Amino acid sequence: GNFLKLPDTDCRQTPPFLVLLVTSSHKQLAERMAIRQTWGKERMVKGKQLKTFFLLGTTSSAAETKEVDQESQRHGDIIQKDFLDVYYNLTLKTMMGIEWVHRFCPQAAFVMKTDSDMFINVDYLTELLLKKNRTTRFFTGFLKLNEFPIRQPFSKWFVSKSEYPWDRYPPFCSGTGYVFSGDVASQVYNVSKSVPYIKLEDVFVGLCLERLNIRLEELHSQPTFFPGGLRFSVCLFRRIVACHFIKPRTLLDYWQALENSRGEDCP
Ligand SMILES: *[C@@H]1O[C@H](CO)[C@@H](O[C@@H]2O[C@H](CO)[C@@H](O)[C@H](O)[C@H]2NC(C)=O)[C@H](O)[C@H]1NC(C)=O
Ligand SMILES: CO[C@@H]1O[C@H](CO)[C@H](O)[C@H](O[C@@H]2O[C@H](CO)[C@@H](O)[C@H](O)[C@H]2NC(C)=O)[C@H]1O
Ligand SMILES: O=c1ccn([C@@H]2O[C@H](COP(=O)(O)OP(=O)(O)O)[C@@H](O)[C@H]2O)c(=O)[nH]1
Ligand SMILES: *[C@@H]1O[C@H](CO[C@@H]2O[C@@H](C)[C@@H](O)[C@@H](O)[C@@H]2O)[C@@H](O)[C@H](O)[C@H]1NC(C)=O
Ligand SMILES: [Mn+2]
């Protein structure tokens, strides 16, 4: 599948319950280390297996290439293919992770694609997934159902009429963090080449899901995904799945907070 790097893992021997696919660029070593020491730490969660992998492309920098090679050797949790790792190549990065699930971890019950600047409560997520009784063609996160392409020309998410010619986008979930049943990876990979390309990964995936007639669903009666970020509180963070706008130092402090208060009860 042209994977310069493959994780040292065997999903047939121990099928994971939840696989985390984390996007980060080569220089963001601090982010990856904070995740590996916090919510990305592999463990049983209510007896369910959690695995964490980092999606990376390639870089022109010889120094960064070397560092990432050493990191892969030392940690074995990097999935890599030869594509220029840049913001407007995030669609390739996403499709690489989905390809990895399809070819090497079709046993995964659930897969979460997430950003590096995020806080994820796998405990609460696992609890909600076990409660949802939705194991096939399932896809959730922060639902974006009536979106219009951004035509403001210097905007990060700007798309020309040539890049996306229609007035509205299909349903999709924030690329900050979305979750799906493992089977969906195979279906998306399968239809990927037939769907109109878009440089925005979450929209691209939304196009594929629409082609597949897979409808987006809310994970819970209450909001659990926060692309806009949140005011921090131990009690609030115990009852959410994902929060954006979290830098590495902050992530470590939040993880420590939750550890320090483990054992107290909340309203
Ligand atoms: C996305 O990554 C692809 C693959 O690396 C980039 O395409 C290559 O661009 C390099 C220059 O960096 C050329 O030398 C190659 O001929 C291209 N190869 C292919 C297969 O296209 C592409 O430029 C990247 N996208 C963006 C927006 O930077
Ligand atoms: C003010 O919030 C922003 O509002 C725009 C619409 O006006 C849009 O909903 C933004 O979400 C982004 O939408 C992009 C496609 O247009 C998508 O590729 C990005 O990943 C979205 N970003 C987030 C944070 O989900 C929204 O931020
Ligand atoms: O070349 C790049 C640029 C960004 N990212 C990742 O893509 C996600 C989105 O980037 P960022 O948070 O900077 O932007 P946002 O989409 O929250 O505006 C993050 O996990 C980044 O680490 C990446 O893997 N490669
Ligand atoms: C998930 O299922 C729980 C167990 O209910 C039993 O099993 C499911 C698969 C159905 O066949 C149901 O008719 C059975 O009684 C429920 O307690 C729980 O509410 C379900 N969760 C949701 C979100 O509906
Ligand atoms: Mn981000």
Residue numbers in the entry: 42 to 308
How did the manuscript describe this experimental structure?
Human β1,3-galactosyltransferase 5 (β3GalT5) is a key enzyme involved in the synthesis of glycans on glycoproteins and glycolipids that are associated with various important biological functions, especially tumor malignancy and cancer progression, and has been considered as a promising target for development of anticancer agents. The catalytic domain adopts a mixed α/β Rossmann-like fold commonly observed in the GT-A glycosyltransferases superfamily and consists of a seven-stranded β sheet core (β1, β2, β3, β4, β5, β6, and β7) surrounded primarily by α helices (α1, α2, α3, α4, α5, α6, and α7), a two-strand antiparallel β sheet (β5′ and β7’),23 and an additional 13-residue α helix (α8) at the C terminus. Based on the structures obtained from our experiments, β3GalT5 catalyzes the transfer of galactose from UDP-Gal to a broad spectrum of glycan acceptors with an SN2-like mechanism; however, in the absence of a glycan acceptor, UDP-Gal is slowly converted to UDP and two other products, one is galactose through an SN2-like mechanism with water as an acceptor and the other is an oxocarbenium-like product, presumably through an SN1-like mechanisms. While β3GalT5 selectively binds to UDP-Gal as the donor substrate, it exhibits broader selectivity for acceptor substrates.
In total, we obtained eight structures, including β3GalT5 in complex with UDP-Gal, Gb4 glycan, GlcNac-β1,3-Gal, GlcNAc-β1,3-GalNAc, and Man-β1,6-Man. All structures belong to the P1 21 1 space group, with each asymmetric unit containing two protein molecules. Using disaccharides as substrates and measuring the end point UDP concentration after 1 h reaction time, we have selected Man-β1,6-Man and GlcNAc-β1,3-GalNAc-α-Thr in addition to Gb4 glycan and GlcNAc-β1,3-Gal-OMe for further structural studies of the enzyme–substrate complex obtained from β3GalT5 cocrystallized with UDP-Gal and soaked with various acceptors. The acceptor binding moiety has relatively fewer interactions in comparison to the donor binding moiety, resulting in a wider tolerance to different acceptors. The indole lid is turned off when no receptor is bound but is activated by forming a stacking interaction with the nonreducing end of acceptor.
